[PDB]
């Protein structure tokens, strides 16, 4: 471009965006608007717990939960690990991160936080999946 | 009132002070016009640094120190010189 062009219209950068828009918003019941807040984790209520079939190179029953967030955005997350204490209406805590198998799951569920029971008999990579030491 | 006082610096339980020219309306640490020395008693005696010319100029222009600063300026001989210059 010519410098005249670059003054008549400047370089307008490639607009960016997040891999987790649901975490980057909030809600005040008074004015009832999306409040933009950069929150690492959130709370939600599992509105469904089920299984899904992953993409073609893989084959499995991937455990998901559809969840109703504090900010009233409904979100599909993954239940990592082996086993869960979850049901519909079960309070849950959510963190970010894709699950490359299904597309519609941009989020993960956290273990050891709330009604989510810690994983059972997991001794390695233990902070992850949230289960206390075997003494 | 325009005043010549001392403002607090340094960590807790290890204080230090800067003599300073401050209005009484400003905070303990805030607006100031000029610094004219500094102070700490953390030595076995007290220990002092001063700027005689500027502090005497503000005293002439109408300053009004606090009690401890008056003691310090007495030990450094500035109040006596101001008195003499008024005589």
């Amino acid at each position: 471009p010519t410098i005249n062009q670059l003054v008549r219209k400047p370089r307008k950068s490639k607009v960016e965006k997040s891999d987790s828009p649901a975490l980057n918003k909030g809600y005040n019941s008074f004015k009832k608007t999306q409040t933009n807040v950069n929150s690492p984790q959130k709370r939600g209520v599992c509105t469904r717990v089920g299984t899904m079939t992953p993409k073609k190179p893989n084959s499995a029953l991937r455990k998901y939960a559809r969840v109703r967030l504090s900010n009233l955005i409904e979100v599909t997350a993954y239940i990592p690990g082996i086993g869960h204490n979850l049901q519909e209406h079960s309070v849950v805590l959510l963190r970010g991160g894709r699950v490359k198998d299904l597309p519609g799951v941009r989020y993960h569920i956290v273990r050891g936080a709330l009604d989510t029971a810690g994983v059972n008999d997991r001794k390695q990579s233990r902070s992850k999946y949230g289960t206390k030491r075997p003494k | 009132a325009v005043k010549i006082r001392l403002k607090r610096m340094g960590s807790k339980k290890s204080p230090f002070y800067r003599i300073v020219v401050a209005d009484s309306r400003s905070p303990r640490d805030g607006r100031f016009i000029e610094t004219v020395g500094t102070y700490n008693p953390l030595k076995d005696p007290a220990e002092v640094v001063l700027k005689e010319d500027l502090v005497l100029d503000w005293l002439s222009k109408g300053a009004q120190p606090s009690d401890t600063v008056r003691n310090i300026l007495s030990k450094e001989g500035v109040m006596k010189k101001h008195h003499e210059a008024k005589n």
Partner: protein, 81 residues
């Protein structure tokens, strides 16, 4: 001796007003990023004492107290009809 209040040189663009005119300065700042020498046609309102100045005429103006809401400047000269 006392200070000297700011003065500018410029050009007239309208004289349809009594005891007053509009004056244009035409500096040239460099665009901050790309550096090109741009135009910058700042303009002002000047108090004329006698409706002397004519359109498209070079002029000098010194600041002063607000003589109106827009006015801040005082005519000094008339240079090139």
């Amino acid at each position: 001796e006392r200070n000297q209040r700011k003065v500018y040189q410029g050009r007239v663009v309208s004289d349809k007003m009594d005891k007053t005119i509009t004056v244009v300065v035409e500096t040239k700042k460099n665009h901050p990023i790309y550096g090109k020498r741009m135009k910058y046609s700042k303009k002002y309102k000047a108090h004329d004492e006698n409706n002397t100045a004519k359109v498209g005429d070079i002029v000098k103006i010194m600041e002063t107290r607000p003589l109106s809401a827009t006015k801040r400047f005082r005519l000094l000269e008339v240079v090139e009809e």
